Design a protein around this ligand. Sequence first.
Ligand SMILES: *[C@@H]1O[C@H](CO)[C@@H](O[C@@H]2O[C@H](CO)[C@@H](O)[C@H](O)[C@H]2NC(C)=O)[C@H](O)[C@H]1NC(C)=O
Ligand code: CL
Ligand code: ZN
Length: 314
Amino acid sequence: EEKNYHQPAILNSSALRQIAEGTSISEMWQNDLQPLLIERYPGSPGSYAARQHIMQRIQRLQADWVLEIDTFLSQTPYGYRSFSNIISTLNPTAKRHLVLACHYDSKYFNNRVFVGATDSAVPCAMMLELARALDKKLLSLKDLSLQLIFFDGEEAFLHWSPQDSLYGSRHLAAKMASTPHPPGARGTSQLHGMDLLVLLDLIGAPNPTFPNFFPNSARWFERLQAIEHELHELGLLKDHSLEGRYFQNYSYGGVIQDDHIPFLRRGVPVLHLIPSPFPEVWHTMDDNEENLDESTIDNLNKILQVFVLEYLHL
Ligand SMILES: *[C@@H]1O[C@H](CO)[C@@H](O[C@@H]2O[C@H](CO)[C@@H](O)[C@H](O)[C@H]2NC(C)=O)[C@H](O)[C@H]1NC(C)=O
Ligand SMILES: [Cl-]
Ligand SMILES: [Zn+2]
């Protein structure tokens, strides 16, 4: 309905510089990102500490985020285990929400530990830094708002299959599909109030190239392209080339499995910020803090924060 005709309020140069300046890559690194770089596969003590970190960093902000933990047991190749997706919503009774999402588990695995630095500590920390950098503007919103989702159990425990993967997202898309929205309404569920799902995944590697995956989000991907482009021209990006842009005029010809899968196949539009090709380090012990690129991530935070403000008209 409205989602289909919704237009961004495009911000001027002055307002661009403000967004570029009001985000801190170093704050994100030390306060949002470093505490997540721990083994945190589903049900582990590392999972719990990560969950606690996420909630804590969320609670500390004046915007009136409403947190909710969707916990549940699912059969795994290692028997029943516990999962906990984390939902942070502003204005939970607002009809429409822009949704941001990462998976916050790490994949269960040299006498080294897998910490999924791109996969996906960085996407989560970016979500966190967005919530902090925009706090004051998000505070004003207190019938479209913002939701953050951190999915648990994205990864296969053993071998990626329909039943061994995406435990978090598949359980939550279904919860949301059978839950009336707004509360005490008839016919319409919580998925239906999902304007757009923007899934960040595998972000942090140098020189990422993000395809335009879905016609029904193509105009939103376009907005990312114009945004990168304008932040670039204003000298607000770092180590940034037009020839090496993140957001390319490229469509993708395969199907990627990820947390958007159970929302997409129920008709939620998806803007899938996963690069192709996948980072050199993907599903290797090398996916660590060392192999991450500061300026890339700093840059994408600014593209992303602008995208978000424009969508919310903020
Ligand atoms: C570009 O956009 C910004 C939006 O932030 C404009 O600044 C606003 O100007 C109006 C008009 O007086 C004020 O009500 C707001 O208080 C201003 N906002 C802020 C955050 O300062 C800015 O004037 C616009 N500039 C141009 C050249 O178009
Ligand atoms: Cl465990
Ligand atoms: Zn992965």
